Amino acid sequence: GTFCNRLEWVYFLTSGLAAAAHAIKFHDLNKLTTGKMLFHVQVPRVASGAGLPTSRQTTIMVTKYSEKSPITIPFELSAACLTYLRETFEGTI
Amino acid sequence: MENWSALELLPKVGIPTDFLTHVKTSAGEEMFEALRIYYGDDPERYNIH
Amino acid sequence: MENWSALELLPKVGIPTDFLTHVKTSAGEEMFEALRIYYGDDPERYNIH
Amino acid sequence: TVSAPATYGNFVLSPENAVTAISYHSILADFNSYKAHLTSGQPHLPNDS
Amino acid sequence: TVSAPATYGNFVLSPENAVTAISYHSILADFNSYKAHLTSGQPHLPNDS
Amino acid sequence: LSQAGAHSLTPLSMDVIRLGEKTVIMENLRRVYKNTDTKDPLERNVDLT
């Protein structure tokens, strides 16, 4: 019995979808709850005409948020592979 | 709930904002989550405790 | 209700804390304002938000 | 053929960010830059964190 | 005769504390010593703020 | 009136088009009514009975 060991390796940065993202590696995300991104924007007025009700300065303070997403994969090991890796045995070939 | 004073006191960055629709419409139709829209000059950003 | 994990993980000033009565007596008979007594070893100090 | 970022976006935490993380359960990114530009006088940073 | 303090000592805000006063509505006194002994690992401050 | 002022000259790049060897300036006033409170008067309402 034999095996097969050809895999088409793909990478997140080599793929074209990395143009959609701005990949950031930050090692302590597990302590993070929510990441906000608060913005402040004031509007430009326009000078009013004669007798019109006029505007005034209006500032707007909004706040974006982050989204958590956990991904995973399980994988297993046989016990004979474990006792082969933890210690070598002499003997025949 | 949200410390809006820290937005008005801390130094920001300068970005070219490009909202999709008009910004007062996006404010009044509640696309964003938390809003602090007002008019005039609030002195709220001064009484620091 | 304060963050007692912040008291735990921050480095403290070593003081010869020597009040009059027993410690459990001065605690359980309410000498101080806000008490927090874990008897085992609480893992709430290890969760940072 | 386009130019692609060959590295991930490595991004570290400052020690006083760790102090704020312990004490107030919060993180202000690029705390040194905010602290400098506050006491300096300019209200516009170069860029975000 | 006794050696009395001639004037009142001054506790001053280090400019680290101004950012915490603005954002998180608190002052953690002696901020830089806490930062140094937190990044050093030594759990005992030499003295209190 | 033609004598009145308009002394110096400064360059600027705009978009122009040929209309039968009568060149005219293309221009849109979107960016001046970008996030304002008035109505752009180039938009209009026309009645048909």
CA gap B45, B4 in Å, rounded: 8
D6 touches chain A (CB under 8 A): yes
Token couple for D33: 């830059």
Under a CB-based contact definition with an 8 Å cutoff, are residues B37 and A60 in contact?
Answer: yes
DSSP bridge pairs for A41 = A60
Residue among D24, D26, D35 whose CB faces E16 most closely: D35
DSSP 8-class letter at C4: H
Q: Do chains B and E touch (3 or more CB pairs under 8 A)?
A: yes
- Structure determined via: cryo-EM
CA gap A49, A45 in Å, rounded: 13
Query: Which site among D1, D2, D3, D11 would you substitute to test the A interface, given the most A Cβ atoms closer than 10 Å to its Cβ?
Result: D11
CA gap D38, E3 in Å, rounded: 41
Residue among B8, B39, B40 whose CB faces A40 most closely: B8
Which chains sit next to E, with 3 or more Cβ pairs under 8 A?
B, C, D
DSSP D1-47: ------S--B----HHHHHHHHHHS---SSHHHHHHHHHHS--EES-
Helix or strand (DSSP H, E) at B28: helix B23-28
Which chains sit next to A, with 3 or more Cβ pairs under 8 A?
B, C, D, F
Query: In degrees to the nearest 10, what's the CA dihedral of C44, A33, B35, D48?
Result: 120
Q: Do chains D and B touch (3 or more CB pairs under 8 A)?
A: yes
Q: After which residues is chain B broken (C to N over 2.5 A)?
A: none
Token couple for D40: 């300096």
Chain B residues bordering chain D (beta-carbon distance below 8 Å): 10-14
Strands A58-64 and B12-13: unpaired
CA gap A81, D46 in Å, rounded: 55
Say what angle helices E31-40 and D15-24 make with each other, to 10 degrees.
100
Three-state DSSP string of chain F: CCCCCCCCCCCCCCEEECCCCCCEEECCCCCCCCCCCCCCCCCCCCCCC
Query: In degrees to the nearest 10, what's the CA dihedral of D11, D16, D17, D23?
Result: 160
E18 touches chain D (CB under 8 A): yes
Residue D19 burial (CB < 10 Å; 0-12/13-18/19+)?
buried
CA gap D11, A24 in Å, rounded: 7
| Nearest-CA distance D33 → chain E (Å) | 11
Residue F23 has φ and ψ, to the nearest 5°, of -75, 135
The amino acid present at A72, given as its one-letter code, is T
Compare all CA atoms of chain D with the CA of B7 and give the residue at the minimum distance: D43
Helix or strand (DSSP H, E) at A38: strand A37-42
CA gap B24, F36 in Å, rounded: 9
